[PDB]
């Protein structure tokens, strides 16, 4: 459902950590609104 489908992105989260949002990360760790990743957990960039 408009996840880890890896087409159009759009993406603004904060920048402290995330800052991004849409695909384009072959769903590493669960589709998320996020920074180039999946952060869900108190994190930056990354889980």
């Keep these: 459902g408009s996840g880890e489908v890896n087409k159009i992105i759009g993406s603004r989260t904060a920048g402290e950590g995330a800052m991004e949002y849409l695909?384009?990360?072959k769903?590493?760790?669960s589709p998320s609104w996020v920074p180039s990743s999946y952060i869900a957990a108190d994190v930056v960039s990354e889980y």
């Design 23 to 25: 695909i384009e990360w």
């Design 27 to 29: 769903d590493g760790h």
